[PDB]
Amino acid sequence: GPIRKVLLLKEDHEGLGISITGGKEHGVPILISEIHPGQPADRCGGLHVGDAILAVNGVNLRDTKHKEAVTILSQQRGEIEFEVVYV
């Protein structure tokens, strides 16, 4: 599908509300496998199961290993911009 830019708002006491799978060591993108109900990703409205996360806050995630992506993603705070695509 089309590449989308999506804004997510979260407070410091919560996580993103996403489960991710995949990663470069597996030859696949960082993929959203769950959106946890009522948490920031669900509330933001524009992120969905099956989305590949291509970048976050200008940080490219297309060739990142799983744990690299976890560190990068969990570091982001407040108003967070995602670039995503559903295939």
């Binding site: 996580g15 993103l16 996403i18 489960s19 991710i20 799978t21 995949g22 990663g23 597996h26 696949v28 496998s33 769950e34 946890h36 799983h66 744990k67 976890v70 993603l73 969990s74």
Partner: peptide
């Protein structure tokens, strides 16, 4: 593949 909640 591994899965992490974040």
């Amino acid at each position: 593949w591994p899965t992490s909640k974040i």
